[PDB]
Design a protein around this ligand. Sequence first.
Ligand SMILES: N=C(N)N1CCC[C@@H](C[C@@H](C=O)NC(=O)CN2CCC[C@H](NS(=O)(=O)Cc3ccccc3)C2=O)C1
Ligand code: NA
Ligand code: NA
Lengths: 26, 249, 8
Amino acid sequence: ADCGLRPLFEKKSLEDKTERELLESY
Amino acid sequence: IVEGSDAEIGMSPWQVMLFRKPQELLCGASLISDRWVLTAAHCLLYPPWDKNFTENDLLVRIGKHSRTRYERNIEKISMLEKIYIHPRYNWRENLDRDIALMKLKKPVAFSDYIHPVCLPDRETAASLLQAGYKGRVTGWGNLKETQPSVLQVVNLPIVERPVCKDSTRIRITDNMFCAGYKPDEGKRGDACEGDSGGPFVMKSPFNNRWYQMGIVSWGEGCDRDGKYGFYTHVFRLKKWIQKVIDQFG
Amino acid sequence: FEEIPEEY
Ligand SMILES: N=C(N)N1CCC[C@@H](C[C@@H](C=O)NC(=O)CN2CCC[C@H](NS(=O)(=O)Cc3ccccc3)C2=O)C1
Ligand code: NA
Ligand code: NA
């Protein structure tokens, strides 16, 4: 429901330090 | 994890520690609801090694960051109510269908550090499970064929099936995928002992959600050139996942 | 491992 949306990142619109590396590969 | 880096606080809030009450780290696991944990069947049952863990042998620890400190006010430790192993798990040959569900004695409460990951739908699976797309693995396992103080993270590329097949003598099944950089890639990384049962997750670019595509399963050595880590294929087994929860929780 | 609460 609320699955996979992190309280400290997605919910606050902050990115973790290497998640762009994932998105950039897609 | 080999060649990874320390995780950020709350970076992988579905990461679970399978803890043996000697009191030792057995494997990772992942939180998929308030009452359900997903892990590798071999974490619990591996007859060749005389491993057959029962509900009362284990503890599940959630919201952890540090490998060894008891993180007062942060982590939550649950008791298992029941273990479910895939009826067709193949421990005799290749760890085919390396997956289990653990139902907690009581629903856990979400927090900044505890949150469930999503399970893929056929279409999320269809577009993300592609060679070259990167996923993320996490765990507290060996660093080297050797232990971190905190949770480690590493981003790894999915590799083409043929390449997977040709790197080993084990025979590979549709229930597995492999990931890692190729010798040529000049980027390393791999899961290692103690990482098993942890999540291989990807972040959907459509809905900005994190999906668990794989489960740390098996490999040969850690971060070897020309070798690759193998993961259970979560989507292919989703039917079985649904079911158990449905037929029982 | 730092010991854990006994209640667990
Ligand atoms: N990603 C890697 N490079 N790995 C390889 C080294 C560490 C592994 C995590 C581990 C955590 O428990 N999984 C393993 O121990 C599962 N398993 C059980 C028996 C031995 C087997 N490895 S093996 O014996 O080299 C090859 C083999 C694989 C599958 C079934 C039997 C034989 C293994 O990987 C993953
Ligand atoms: Na082969
Ligand atoms: Na490798």
